[PDB]
Each structure stands twice: as structure tokens, then as C-alpha cells.
Amino acid sequence: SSLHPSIPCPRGHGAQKAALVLLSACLVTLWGLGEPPEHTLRYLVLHLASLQLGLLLNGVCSLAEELRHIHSRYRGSYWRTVRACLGCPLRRGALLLLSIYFYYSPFTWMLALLGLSQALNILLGLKGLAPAEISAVCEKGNFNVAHGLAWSYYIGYLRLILPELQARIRTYNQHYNNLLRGAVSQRLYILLPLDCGVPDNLSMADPNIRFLDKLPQQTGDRAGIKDRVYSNSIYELLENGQRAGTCVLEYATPLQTLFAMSQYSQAGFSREDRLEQAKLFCRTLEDILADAPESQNNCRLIAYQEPADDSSFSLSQEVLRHLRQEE
């Protein structure tokens, strides 16, 4: 919500307010018309009971599938299989009895009609979920690709190199770097292009940044591999032909993974998905770094969207703009 105005905000409570207004208008309209309220009570109860019976029939129809994978998904219990499909059995049974008692007061004819309607819905696929209705059920439950990618990035990279970053910078400044050249600042800078176009060579896309030197590497043992290696680099920020400063630059590799996923046919990843996924990845990474012990005191996030008209946009300008708040 601060990285870029294009990043969305989490969903709120507009639906409940609209539902309340609709309920109030419906109640006022019912009061305006002349009728006793007992009919309203009876019809409302009957409608709710019919809805419950429809849900139960759908659950029984769906149970014909989940009983083929019992020994693989539900261990070996018939009681967990019915829990996955039919919510919570005890509440469902209580609602069953209440609905049957309130609906029995001809009658067997309507059960057949509900059966036909439910079977038609299952077969012909009349019922379904809108694109903005499955996008709000997988956001509260964390069923995203970018959620996993951001947590992987944090755990595997930033929880590892961030604590020991300043020691390497200090050693490079004293032991190796000469005093005549300018010192490299702290706070590793992460660039997050909200386009997933990550160039392999950073010298491209801007002639004003050139590769200067490297950093001492760090090693560790991870997942049965001895002496994994981590490395970084230092770049030069030319200002109108002369140097203006130095920094430590990186893109975000999961953006490259998203871009490469969007082109293979087997991935099943649309070209409209990997923009919302990039913005969601940026939001989640910012939230994770907000309250981590190795907080933004050691890294800064930069998000930019490439203008279509090329309005004299250069990466170096934005990088210097962000560098100028350090002091």
C-alpha cells in the first residue's frame, strides 16, 4: 500500500453492508404491503429447509467420488470421509431432523422435484463460482502460488543472508576497497518489476549502471549438500557521465519463475494471472518483512511499472531517488 498505488488492498466488509441495506429495504417493503406475518414465517422456514435438503443431496452425490480414494486420502476411516463432504455430521443431522419436521407439515412429490433440480445442477453445470468469487475464497485461505513463492524466498534466502550482510560489507570496505573510491552503502536493494520481465544481465535496460566488483561469499550445509555458496555484487550508478553513488542490486527470482511458468502449456498459467500474482507476491513479501527480526533495516523494496510511452523513465533515477532518503 506504499510500494506502489497499483497494489490492491485486502478485501473488506462491503458485502455485509450491502446485504444489510437489502434486508432493510425488503423489510420496509413487506411492512408497506398488507399481509399477516405468519405467512412470511412459514414461507421463510420452508425455503430454508429446502435449501438444507438440497445441500445434503449434493453432499451424498459427491460422496460417490471420495470413497474411491479412502486408503490414500482419508487413511482408513469411513468417518473422516463423511466429515470432508458433509461438513460436521452432528449439526447436519440436527438440521436434517428440524427441516424434515418443519417440511412434513402432496409431500413425496416435492422430494422428487428437488432431486431432479439437484441432478440437473450437477450434470448440466448451472451452478458455479464467478471469477471474483473464487478469488475471495482462496485469499482468506492462502491458496495462492505467490504465497508459497514468497515464503520460500524468505525462508531460503533472506532468513539466511540478512543477519551476516553488514559484516561482509564492512570487511570489503576496510581490507580490500581503497579509501579513494566511495563506500558502498548498507541495505541491499531488491528490485521488483511488476511485469515479470527479469533481464539476465543487469547492465541491459539502462546504460548508466556498470558492474564494479563482488563480495566475499558465505557457505553452509543444506539438505545433504556440503558447502552451498551465496554471492552478491556491487554496481555503479553513473550520473550524467560521473558517479553518484553505489549500492547492492538484485531482482527477485520468483518473478522470473512466474514469467517462465506463464509460457509453458502444461503449467496452465494464463497471461492475466501472472500480473495479479506478481502484485500479490510483492504485498506478501512486504508484510513478511514488516515484523521480521531482520527487518527492512537491511533491505529496501522497489516496485515500478514500465510506462508504455517511455516518458524518459530510467532505472537509475528511481534508484538514486530511493538512495537519497538514507541520510
Ligand X SMILES: Nc1nc(=O)c2ncn([C@@H]3O[C@@H]4COP(=O)(O)O[C@H]5[C@@H](O)[C@H](n6cnc7c(N)ncnc76)O[C@@H]5COP(=O)(O)O[C@@H]3[C@@H]4O)c2[nH]1
Q: Which residues bind ligand X (CB under 6 A)?
A: 152-153, 156-157, 223, 225, 228, 230, 250, 253-254, 257
Asked whether residue 231 is marked as a ligand-binding residue, the answer is yes
211, β-bridge pairs: 235
Asked whether residue 228 is marked as a ligand-binding residue, the answer is yes
Q: Which of 205, 192, 209, 306 is nearest to 254 (CA)?
A: 192
Asked whether residue 77 is marked as a ligand-binding residue, the answer is no
Q: Is residue 240 part of the contact set for a second copy (CB under 8 A)?
A: no
The label of the residue with cell 547492492 reads: 248
Cα gap 40→38, rounded to integer Å: 5
Cα gap 108→284, rounded to integer Å: 54
Cα gap 205→199, rounded to integer Å: 8
Residues 6+ apart with CB under 8 A from 170: none
Cβ atoms within 10 Å of 95's Cβ, excluding its own: 17
Query: Nearer Cβ to ligand X, position 117 or 257?
Result: 257
Cβ 66 to a second copy shortest distance, Å: 6
Binding mask 50-69 for a second copy (x = CB under 8 A): -x-----x-xxxxxxxx-xx
Query: Nearer Cβ to a second copy, position 180 or 229?
Result: 229
- State the binding partner of 264 from ligand X, a second copy, none, CB within 5 to 8 A by kind: a second copy
Residues 6+ apart with CB under 8 A from 200: none
Residue 43: enclosing H or E segment and its boundaries?
Answer: helix 37-66
Binding mask 23-52 for a second copy (x = CB under 8 A): xxxxx-xxx-x-x-xx-xxxxxx-xx--x-
Query: Nearer Cβ to ligand X, position 123 or 225?
Result: 225
- State the binding partner of 157 from ligand X, a second copy, none, CB within 5 to 8 A by kind: ligand X
Nearest residue to the partner ligand X, using Cβ: 156
In the window 301-320, what residues touch a second copy (CB under 8 A)? none
Q: Which residues are annotated as a binding site?
A: 152, 157, 228-231, 253
